[PDB]
Structure formats: C-alpha cells, structure tokens
Amino acid sequence: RGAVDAKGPLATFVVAGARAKLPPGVRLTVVGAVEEEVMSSRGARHLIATREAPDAVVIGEPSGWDGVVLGYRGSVALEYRVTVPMSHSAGP
Amino acid sequence: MTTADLLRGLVSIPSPSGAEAPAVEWLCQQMAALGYQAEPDGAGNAVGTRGEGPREIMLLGHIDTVPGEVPVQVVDGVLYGRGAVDAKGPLATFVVAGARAKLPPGVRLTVVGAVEEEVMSSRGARHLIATREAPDAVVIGEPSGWDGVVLGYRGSVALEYRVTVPMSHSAGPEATAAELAADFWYRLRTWCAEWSVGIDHAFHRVEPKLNALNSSSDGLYGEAVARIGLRLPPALSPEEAIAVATSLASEGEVTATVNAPAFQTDKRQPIVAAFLAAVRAHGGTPRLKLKTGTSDMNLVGPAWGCPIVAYGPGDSRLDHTPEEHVPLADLERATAILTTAIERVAAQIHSG
Amino acid sequence: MLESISPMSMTTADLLRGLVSIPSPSGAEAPAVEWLCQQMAALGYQAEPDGAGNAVGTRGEGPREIMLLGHIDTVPGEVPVQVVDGVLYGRGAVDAKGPLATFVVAGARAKLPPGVRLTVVGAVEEEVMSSRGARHLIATREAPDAVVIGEPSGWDGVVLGYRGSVALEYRVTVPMSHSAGPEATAAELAADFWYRLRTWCAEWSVGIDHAFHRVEPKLNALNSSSDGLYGEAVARIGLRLPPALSPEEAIAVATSLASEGEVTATVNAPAFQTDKRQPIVAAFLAAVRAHGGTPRLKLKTGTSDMNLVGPAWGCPIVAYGPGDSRLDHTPEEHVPLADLERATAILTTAIERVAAQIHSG
Amino acid sequence: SMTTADLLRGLVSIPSPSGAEAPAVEWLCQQMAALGYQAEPDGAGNAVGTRGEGPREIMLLGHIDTVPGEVPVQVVDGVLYGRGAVDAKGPLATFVVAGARAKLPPGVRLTVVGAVEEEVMSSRGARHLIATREAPDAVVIGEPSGWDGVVLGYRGSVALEYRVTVPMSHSATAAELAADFWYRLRTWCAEWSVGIDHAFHRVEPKLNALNSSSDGLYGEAVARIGLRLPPALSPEEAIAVATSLASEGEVTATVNAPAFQTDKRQPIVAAFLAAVRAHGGTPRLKLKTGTSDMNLVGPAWGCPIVAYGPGDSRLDHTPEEHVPLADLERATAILTTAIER
Amino acid sequence: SMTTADLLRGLVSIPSPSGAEAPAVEWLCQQMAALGYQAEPDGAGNAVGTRGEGPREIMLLGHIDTVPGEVPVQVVDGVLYGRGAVDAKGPLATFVVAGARAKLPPGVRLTVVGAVEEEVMSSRGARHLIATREAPDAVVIGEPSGWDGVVLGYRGSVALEYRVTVPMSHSATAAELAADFWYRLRTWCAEWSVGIDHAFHRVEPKLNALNSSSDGLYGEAVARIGLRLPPALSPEEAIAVATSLASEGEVTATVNAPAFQTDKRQPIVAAFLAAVRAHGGTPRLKLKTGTSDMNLVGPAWGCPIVAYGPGDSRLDHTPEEHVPLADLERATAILTTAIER
Numbered sequence A: 001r002g003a004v005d006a007k008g009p010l011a012t013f014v015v016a017g018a019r020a021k022l023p024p025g026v027r028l029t030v031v032g033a034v035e036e037e038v039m040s041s042r043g044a045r046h047l048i049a050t051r052e053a054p055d056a057v058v059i060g061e062p063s064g065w066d067g068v069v070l071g072y073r074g075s076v077a078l079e080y081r082v083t084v085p086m087s088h089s090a091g092p
Numbered sequence B: 001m002t003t004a005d006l007l008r009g010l011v012s013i014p015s016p017s018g019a020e021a022p023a024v025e026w027l028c029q030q031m032a033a034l035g036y037q038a039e040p041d042g043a044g045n046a047v048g049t050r051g052e053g054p055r056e057i058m059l060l061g062h063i064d065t066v067p068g069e070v071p072v073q074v075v076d077g078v079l080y081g082r083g084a085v086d087a088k089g090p091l092a093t094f095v096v097a098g099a100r101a102k103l104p105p106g107v108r109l110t111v112v113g114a115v116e117e118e119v120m121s122s123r124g125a126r127h128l129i130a131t132r133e134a135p136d137a138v139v140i141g142e143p144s145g146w147d148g149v150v151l152g153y154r155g156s157v158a159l160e161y162r163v164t165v166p167m168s169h170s171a172g173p174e175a176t177a178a179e180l181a182a183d184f185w186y187r188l189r190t191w192c193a194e195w196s197v198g199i200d201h202a203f204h205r206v207e208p209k210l211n212a213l214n215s216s217s218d219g220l221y222g223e224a225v226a227r228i229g230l231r232l233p234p235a236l237s238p239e240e241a242i243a244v245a246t247s248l249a250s251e252g253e254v255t256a257t258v259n260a261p262a263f264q265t266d267k268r269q270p271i272v273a274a275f276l277a278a279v280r281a282h283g284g285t286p287r288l289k290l291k292t293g294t295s296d297m298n299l300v301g302p303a304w305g306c307p308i309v310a311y312g313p314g315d316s317r318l319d320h321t322p323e324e325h326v327p328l329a330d331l332e333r334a335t336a337i338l339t340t341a342i343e344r345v346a347a348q349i350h351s352g
Numbered sequence C: 001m002l003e004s005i006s007p008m009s010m011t012t013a014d015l016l017r018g019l020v021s022i023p024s025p026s027g028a029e030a031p032a033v034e035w036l037c038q039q040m041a042a043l044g045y046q047a048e049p050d051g052a053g054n055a056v057g058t059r060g061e062g063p064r065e066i067m068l069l070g071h072i073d074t075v076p077g078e079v080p081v082q083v084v085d086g087v088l089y090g091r092g093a094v095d096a097k098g099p100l101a102t103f104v105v106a107g108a109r110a111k112l113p114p115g116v117r118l119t120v121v122g123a124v125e126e127e128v129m130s131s132r133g134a135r136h137l138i139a140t141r142e143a144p145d146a147v148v149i150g151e152p153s154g155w156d157g158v159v160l161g162y163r164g165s166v167a168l169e170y171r172v173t174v175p176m177s178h179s180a181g182p183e184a185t186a187a188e189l190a191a192d193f194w195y196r197l198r199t200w201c202a203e204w205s206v207g208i209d210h211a212f213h214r215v216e217p218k219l220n221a222l223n224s225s226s227d228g229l230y231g232e233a234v235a236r237i238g239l240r241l242p243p244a245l246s247p248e249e250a251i252a253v254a255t256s257l258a259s260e261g262e263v264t265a266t267v268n269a270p271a272f273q274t275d276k277r278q279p280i281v282a283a284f285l286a287a288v289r290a291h292g293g294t295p296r297l298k299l300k301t302g303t304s305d306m307n308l309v310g311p312a313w314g315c316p317i318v319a320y321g322p323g324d325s326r327l328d329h330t331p332e333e334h335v336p337l338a339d340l341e342r343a344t345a346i347l348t349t350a351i352e353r354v355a356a357q358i359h360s361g
Numbered sequence D, E: 001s002m003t004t005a006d007l008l009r010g011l012v013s014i015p016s017p018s019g020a021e022a023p024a025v026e027w028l029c030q031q032m033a034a035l036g037y038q039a040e041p042d043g044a045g046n047a048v049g050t051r052g053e054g055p056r057e058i059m060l061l062g063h064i065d066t067v068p069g070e071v072p073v074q075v076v077d078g079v080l081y082g083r084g085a086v087d088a089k090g091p092l093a094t095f096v097v098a099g100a101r102a103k104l105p106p107g108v109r110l111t112v113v114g115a116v117e118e119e120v121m122s123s124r125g126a127r128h129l130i131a132t133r134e135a136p137d138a139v140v141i142g143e144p145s146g147w148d149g150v151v152l153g154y155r156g157s158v159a160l161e162y163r164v165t166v167p168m169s170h171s172a173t174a175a176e177l178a179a180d181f182w183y184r185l186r187t188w189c190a191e192w193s194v195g196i197d198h199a200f201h202r203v204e205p206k207l208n209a210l211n212s213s214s215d216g217l218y219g220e221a222v223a224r225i226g227l228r229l230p231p232a233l234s235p236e237e238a239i240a241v242a243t244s245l246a247s248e249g250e251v252t253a254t255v256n257a258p259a260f261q262t263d264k265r266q267p268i269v270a271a272f273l274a275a276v277r278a279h280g281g282t283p284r285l286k287l288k289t290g291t292s293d294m295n296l297v298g299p300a301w302g303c304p305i306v307a308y309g310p311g312d313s314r315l316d317h318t319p320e321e322h323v324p325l326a327d328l329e330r331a332t333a334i335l336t337t338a339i340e341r
C-alpha cells in the first residue's frame, strides 16, 4: 500500500536528496506530508501558512521513472436538470 | 341522472390504481338507483347488471387512474379532473346509457368499472376472464372522441434493467453503472427506431419509453436501475421483443413482464359498422382509430373472442396530463350515440 | 372571432378574473393561450400563438418595438377563485397573470407614436420548466428595443434586475476517534462552517435595510455518514448576492472560511441590473409619480425571464406588475383590485413615456 | 511449492457468498502474485491472473463466489469440509496450481479467472469478460466434474417471479392463486419431460420460495421460481409458456442463458480424456443438471470449451459440502496433462 | 351567514390526520378568507386567520388535525358523526364563526389558529407559534369542553419506548422482558395514584403497542408507551423512574409537556362562566385526562388561558365520534359572549 501512491516517490525523495551534491547557498527540504489522500491536505496547507515559498518544488507523485509531470488537467462538474409535464406519449 | 353529473361526482373521488374501493363503492351505490344490480366482485371491480337472458352485453371500462391530481373544476363548458378522459368519462357514459337503453328480452347488460387497468397487473380484467364466461358483445370504455371509434391498441411489455459496478481504480477506462444503464437505453432506443423508420402511425411502430433511470452509490458498489415500457405493434410479439431486449444487455440484467400483444378489430366487422352508423345518427361523422397505448381490450379481446370496440368521449391526447379535461357536451353527445348503439347491437345478438 | 370592444371598456380586474379561472400550470397553457389570444384580438391586437405556443398580440407599426414579456403559466393547484372585500384570490393572481393582464389592457390603452410597435407576450413553461417560451422568442425574433418583464413589483415598485445566486458545497472528511472535544466529528465541522459563514454574511450586511443589497445565506441541506474508519459530512448552502458582492468574491470568503474542509461552488445566476439613470427607468419612475405613487427601485430575488432575455438581448429592461411577490406560489395567492387598475394606469403612461423616448430617438 | 489442498482450505476459510467476493478475490490475487502471475482484480471484481506471453490464450474460468450457509471448515481424515470445497473453490484452486505447474509454448498465454456472481442470476463476473476481453482460444470452466469426469454441458436457466394481489374482503386467497400457478407450471414441465432418462434433457421448475402476506386491505403472495431448461426448450419458449399460465397474476422473467453442450468428439475433450485415462482413470462424460458460466462464454466466444474440476456436484450447496483431499492432487496433475495437450 | 354546523361537516368531510392537514388547512383558510379574515397558512402549515386591528391580541388556538380512522361523515337526527366532530374540528369551526360574529374594540385584534400536529407528540404546530409569534393577551384552546363546560387544565405527557434484545438460542424471551417492564411501570403508577379521585391527579401509563419480533439470531421486542402526568409528577421525575425500571432493556423518552392548569378564579374564567350561565347553562369546571397544546402555550406565553368548545371528550378518538348539532349553535353564541367580555 502506497508503493506507487505515494511512498515510492517519497522514498526516492529521501534517498536522492541525501545523495545529491549541493552547491553553496542552497537548502534542500524533503517533506512527507500528512492527510493528502482521504482528507483536505492539512499537511501542505500548513506548509503554506507557516513557511516561505521555496524557489523550486518537486511533487512526490508517480510519473514513472521515465516520465515527468508538468501539471494537471482542469476539472468540471456538470449538472443537467429537466422537468416535463406527464403524458401518455411514447415518442422521442 | 345526467352523465356529466355522475362524472362530476365520479371524478371527485380519487382512485389511483390500487386504491379504487371508495370510488367503486360510490359507483355501485349510484348504479342501483338507475336499475342495476350493483356489487363489487372478488377483485373489487364495480359491476352493475340489469335484465337477464342467454345473452349479455358488457360495457367494460376502468375506474382506476394514474396518480397526480388535477384540481376538479368546470370552466367555460369544460370539466377538469383526473380520469375525466382516461377513463371515468367513458365509464360514466357507460353507466348512464346502459340504464337508459331500451333492453330487449333475453339480454343482459353488464357495466364494469375495472380496477388496476392503468398498471401492469390489469388485476380487474384478468379476474373477469378467470371467473366469468364470455359475453356476446363488449364495448371498451376508453376515450375515442364522441365522434370516433377505436379499433385497436398497441401491446406492451415492462422491462427492468439492473446493473452493478464495483471499484478497481479505473476512473478512466472501466466505467460507471449509470453509464451502463444509459448504454442499454441507447441500444434499445436505437433498435426500436431502426425498426420503426418511415411508419406514420404509432400503432404500427415499436416505441420504448424510459419511465425511470436511477443510479446510486453506497461507497462499495454502484447500482443502476432503468424502468422501461415497450409499446408493441402487431408485427412484433412480446416474446420477440423481450428476446431482443434480453440480447441487447451486455453486462446488466434484463427483467421482463408481458401485459398483452397488440390487438385490433377489422373495420369490416359488424360492431364497427354499427358504431359508425351510430355516430351519424346524432349529427356525427365517425372516425376509426388505432391507438398508441395498451388497453384491457388486448386481454378480453383474445380471451373471449367476441365482437369488441372502444368508444368514449374525450381527447385521448389528454391522457395522463396535468390538466386532463373534457367538454361537458361531448358526454351526453356520446351518451346518446352509445344508448343507440347498445339497443341495436342487442338486436343483432337477439337476431343471431 | 368576437366583435371589437373598447380597450377602455374592459378593466384589468375583468380580464384577470377570466384569465385566473382557466387552469394553466406549465406545459398545459393551451386553453389559456387560445382564450387570451381571442381577448387580445378583441382589444385591437393582432393576436396568435407562435411556434412555442406563446400567446402573442401586437399593436402599432414601425421599425421600433416595445415588448412586454409576461408568462401565462403557473405552479399547479387551484387557489379558490373568489373576490372578497376588494381582493381577488386565484392561482397566478400575483405570479403572474396579474402582471400579464395589466400588460394586455395597458398595452391596448397606450397611445403610440408613429414607427413604434407593441408586442405583448404570454409566454409558456416559465414557472416549473426551462422557459421554452422566452428561449423560442430569442431563437426566432429580433431583439426588441425595450423589454418590460411581467413580474410582480407592486404597483408603486419598479424592478431593475435580480440578485446573483451562488450554490455552495462544503465537504469534510476526518478519521474516527473517541474524542468529544470541539471539531471532533465531520458533522460538527460542517455545522461550524455554516455558523461562521452565516456570521460573516451578517457582518458584511450590517444595518442594511435594503434586503436585496444584503448577502443572505441558506442551509438547504446538511448530511453526514461514516464507514467506521472515517466520518464525512456535506453542507449544501445557497447564497443570494447583492450587486456589490460578486460570486468569486463570496466564493473567496467561503473558501477562506474553510480550513479542514473543501468548498466547491456553482454560480447559478450572475447578478444583473439596469442602471438607475437609464431612460426606461426614468420613464417608469415618472409614470408611477404621475399617478400619485412613491416609486421604489428594487431587485427580484427569484429567477425569471429577466435572467434569460436580459443577457441575451442586452436591451434596456425592467420588471413591472401589480401584486405582492411574497404571495407567489401560495395557497391563497391574491391581489387587491385597486392595485390592478392603478398599475394599469401607470404602465399605460410608462409605455407612452418609453415610446416617446424611442420616437425622439 | 504449495499444493492444491493447502490452497483450498485458505480459500474455503475465506467466506465469499455472491456479492461479498472482494476479500477472497483480494487474497487469491496475492496467492497468484506470490506464485508468479501478473495478478489484480479487474473492473468487475473478478480475480484475474495471467501467465505466459503472446497472442494465443487459454482461459481457466472458475468462480470464487459461493451460495450462503456456513459450513464449518475442517479436515476429517483427508476430507475437507467447507462452503465452496466442491462448488467451486476446489476447481478454482486447481486452476491456480495446475495453471502455474504446466509449461507453455511461446506465443501462448494462460489466464486464471475467479469470477464473481456465477452462482446468482446476474453472472456479471463472466459478463464483464465478454464485454472487456478478447475471445481466448480455449476455455476450461471451473466446476466439479470429478477427478475422473468431463462435463460437456449444463442446462439453461430462467428465473420466474409470480406476484398476485387479492382484496382482504370477500372472494381464492393470494396464497391459493400462487399455489395453483405453481401447480400448473409444475404439471406442464412434468408432462413435457415425462419418461426422459437424464436431468439434462428435462425441463424442471424449482419453487425456491412462496410467501403470502397481508398488506392490510389486500392479500399478497409472491413465488420465486428457478427454471432449468434443456436444449429443446429455449428461454424464450419457456417464458411464453410461463406467461400463458399466469391467469390472475403476473409473471416476471429474467433470462440467464439457454442450455449449452460441448460436442463429444472435440480435440479439447480428447485432451482431458487422455489426461484422465493416462493418469489411470476411467473417465465418464457427464452432462449436469445445473447451469454454469459456460452457458454464457460458450455462445459468446465459440472456442473449444469444457468443464473440469475435483468434487462431486451432488454436494453442491449442501450443509456439509466436502471433497476428499486425495481428489485435489490428481485433478491438478490431470488438468496439467490436459493443459499441455 | 354560515352556521357552525354547515362549517363543521365541510371540515369533517375533509380528512386531516396528523401529517396530512394541508388540504383541510387550505380549505379552511378560504372559508376564513370568504368570511373576511386575512387568512393564509403560516410557516409550519397552521391555518391562520386574523381579525381587527392594533397591538392587543386574543388568540383562538384550535387544531385541525385528527387521529386516524375513518368515521363515516353523516347526520342522524341532528347528530353529526365524523372524525374530528369532537376532537377538535367542532371547537375549531366554533372559533371561526364566533370569532367573526363578535365585535371588538379598537386596538384589539383576534386571531384564529388551526394548528397542525396537536394530536401527536411533536405538537410542532403550536411550537411554531411559540417560535414565530408574539405572546397574545389571552388564549382560548379549541378542545371539547362541552357547551356548558370550562376546561381549566390538562395532564402532562411523556412518550416512552422500551426496546430489548435477546439471542435466539438458550436463556426470558424478548417478549417476557418487555411485558415485565410494563408490569413494573404499570404497578409503580398504580401504587402511586392509589385512591386518588380524578384522572387529572393520577399518573397513568398507556401501553399503546407491544411487539416482539425474531431478527434471526436475536429475539426483539418493542413497547410504545404513553404516560400522562399530574402536576405533582414532572416529566423529568417520571423519566427518572422509567429509567430505573429498565433493567435488561433501554428506555427512550420524549417530553411533550408537564401538566398545566388554569387557576379557578381567573377573570377569563368568569367571562366564560357568565357566557355559559347567562345563556341558561349550568357550568361545570373540568380538568381533563388527556393533554393539549394549552400545556405548551400556557407556560410559554403566560397570558390568561382556558379551553372551550362543543363536544364530549369521552368520544375523542372513537369509531363513531359525534356531536349533537344543537350543541354547535349554543357554543358559538356562548364563545361570542365570552369573547366580548
């Protein structure tokens, strides 16, 4: 559970982050946020409310090792509603 | 007693299919004052009989209506009320005429107000067929227009499509129950439409009606149920239609109930000739029609094999509509035409 | 066809009584339409049902047109039609056969200048359905030069438009536990969003006696459930917006008010308003005062044809009609006979006043 | 490696009545995953694991659902008791083991399916395969044929529902009408099937439930009827008959499938016969009274198809449903020999 | 002008059991509108019509709902039968007629209320008045006091629900436990109320329903109990007692109201006494066994309050509930004389 969503990417973050050679003047913060999956992301919202915006962000979600995710599709929820008087007809 | 008056009282007693007893009671009470021996049968059918003899003329109408009540009122000559057209109008005409008709000796006059006709059961009609022996003539109490006579009605089948879909993760590929149920409706709608191309009259068409489509989700399994009415022309049997519907369902479950196949009577039949002649005798120009919906005519026609037509004042296009109504004058207009028709059919019967 | 009668002869009360007698819930307006078309034909209109079965009667001549857009359909049910102590009871007396009757009579009384048409419409399927009437007009007719919507504004009131509408959904999911402290459950969380949002709306519109200039919330539904692991809750809220509070503004507040939950939002109606300084408003303000009234500028809360033909045609538009709109869709819907004729006199002048503006050009 | 017997009790120990197959399916897939199958549940909840590589496919279609009733899972002197021991977790477990044991040519992939809802009328587990999968080159249905038996076919199935209403006043009760309908239906089928040797060729109605109730002002009664059809009598024909006996009540009908049978001299039959015979058995070709998902995937796919598995079908749906553990080992090896050929 | 009798049958002919008052309310308002009241239903569905002008208000609070059961509406020699003839459409119709007949001073407005749900435990019709209206200066409750009777009070009411579960195996049935709970409750009340003269001062439990069921593995039983309380025993106290007798089961309680009584020497009482006496009657002051909306609006509003109306309360909820038509005319005139003073 979470091998793909998203402990795999999180594990990769931890290891690669500790292996990565950093130049001077650069910090590296790795975050295992909470309550993202079933809840309203108390984790990330807390970061926003308490921390300065970092200079770059990599999101730990499965893109595949040979894939890179640039963002997300827009979502729209539609509701169609109709009311018609009753009758005996069986036409279209 | 006037037809419009009886109807005015008749339409004031709510009698949706399955809750007919109050109206049935009141009607049995009224028919006695007109000369009938009135009594609700084992099914709850209001039954009024008068006279006696080897023969019998049954005026078979129905007392039940579809739900949804139309506030009862008379405005500018027109009576508004649930079932005023379908079919308490024709039933009131039946009652008045039958007790007004000059009865020859050796002829029974039976007036029936059947229960649950407006539903799949036709519990009242099926009871009549199961317990009574065949009449020598049957007049069906449905709206034909006072200047019109109905020769037949389409048959019908009731379908229920059920399907359940679980949860893998495929929010993209493997899809929803509502989609699967809508997929079934499209298939059936398409098939019926392809069959029915070019055909001008609905009676000779096969037309489906998606009466209901409901999906739900409990968090575990999604479910979808479609309730469909199939209207059948003569050229398409209930068995074949059901077989077709069953074959269209890919993953769902199709459930079917047969009411009756289509039924019609030849215009060359004497009873038709009489009613055509009946309408002219009161300043009318008779019209012959074949209708979209189904009737108890489709049951008693085959089961009893006697001569039969549908006659009743009113616009059948107002069936099941929020302001169903009928002009008061058409009532007594059809009452006179019907009183005549009964007296003449009784003669041909007595004749042989 | 009936013989031509005097437009002055028939009173609005007379016409309304006949009109309110005929049942016409949405979808079943045909007998009402036929009757009204006959009546209008007798009053000097050229009256006939259009493509959608709308009752349409025209007067005048020319390249300019004032449309009086009312509806002939109602909610179902019969309010026992009776006249007692100068009050007419009946279904649609206020919504909206009263305003429609006023349209017919005032339109036939109104003196028109040359080059001006006058089209009175009794539209169908506005009340319970999706306004097949008005949508048909838009699809088949040219945009008129002025539109008066037949909705109850009161005889001494003039409606400039309608408030914006926003449907909110707050949703929250929390893990189950044994605790009984504050915000322990999803339902408590959903309920408290309602309180804090309800509080804000009151804060925003403090001291505002003009109700249509207030933001007023409504908790239409609140539900909750649990699977033993998590509890969920949903609050469905309607927000009726004043002109100075756009949806996205109100939606931003709600969003900011929610922490542990997520708020989604649908804008049901963008707010819409004809400006106070506009000629058509000047005409109606003048018309009301000309007949001894103190006119009130107001907005409709509920939706109407104004919500459709407004954004479509974009022409100057107001809503006017006798009757108290609080009585809309009520078992004893009624209107005073005095208000009918008073509104008829006022609209008569207003039509003349608008036609005067248009003719001056 | 795990034997079929250790696999069976684990599956039998996990209750999976129709509608509640998820934990069983879930567990079965990891058993398939541990064994090396690419295995997850599909869109309908079927347990699916597939072997090999290529465009040619053999399918071992079993079902993981069972009828209700708690049969205590226990071993009594080499005899395993439990709901599904025969119908049909035994055959399904056999599929999982023999399916991995066998060695396949290149281009030939094997797929094991633990379908849901086979026992009930929906059969939606199999129906999802028909809707979402390409037709395999051959199918083995996972039903108890016996270790030395080969099932070539099953009867069709139509469920019937009779409902009748009578007023709670004066004039036959709802119960009497419903019972007489059953009497008519039962007699029609008995007179049709008179003197016929085997169950496969007879039409047999099954009164699963009859219940009369008092609405208050109405008397009510319903009859749940299962109908098992031979090849000679189609679902369509049987419904027409059922309709004609309704009289005062109404009959509601739901078609499962017509009867189906595999032709006796098929190469796929010879393969199993040999597998039985060469493993020291005396095969008896059987045609069974009940129905199967074979009756759906058969007419749908058209590929060579048979039913095979350990277990005596007479023990199906019984309070002490059981299978000898010895039967499991042989059936696994026999299926393997069959699979190869 | 319409008499109370012609008004009554029209109302009685329109069924209005609790929950289904809308058509009755709807019709009553037009009867009030035709008579000259400003009349519409309010937010809860109460039928409301108000008279006069000003800041001072007398309220005639009746109820339009009835208990179920069809009592054939008919007149038999000046006797009107029908559900609600006594309880309480009779008093309500009397309110509508006497309420219009009387002449009022300026600043004094009269309001007639046909409340919903008085008969059931919710009493939400009256509760909506408490929530949405200013307290009137006086109230007349529309209950059958008799044409020459003045009701000063009613008992309180608490509904009790006992539920008990027992396994369907081995060791008291659900029915036995529930029955013994009733036995305990019935005995406690009887021993408390022993030798007390009138029903008003006694505590009386009412076993409206006891039903045992078999869940399948559990035996179940529920008991619906109405409890009528005297002033000496509060709802709070009575629930504590009920709780203490639960033992193996649980008791669920819902408070209607405590007992209420109008003090015998009130000016509003004198007004009715006079109205009775001056109209040739011999008034008997009564305290009734049942409850009323008086028990809610009383403690809420605190204004002078009494119950008056035609009808014998013993006929309440009976299969042939009826009132003499003669009683209607007198009650209307008496209420009028009372109203004026």
Ligand SMILES: [Cl-]
Residues within 6 Å of the ligand: D196, D197, D198, D201
């Ligand atoms: Cl044989």
Ligand SMILES: [Cl-]
Residues within 6 Å of the ligand: E196, E197, E198, E201
């Ligand atoms: Cl005492």
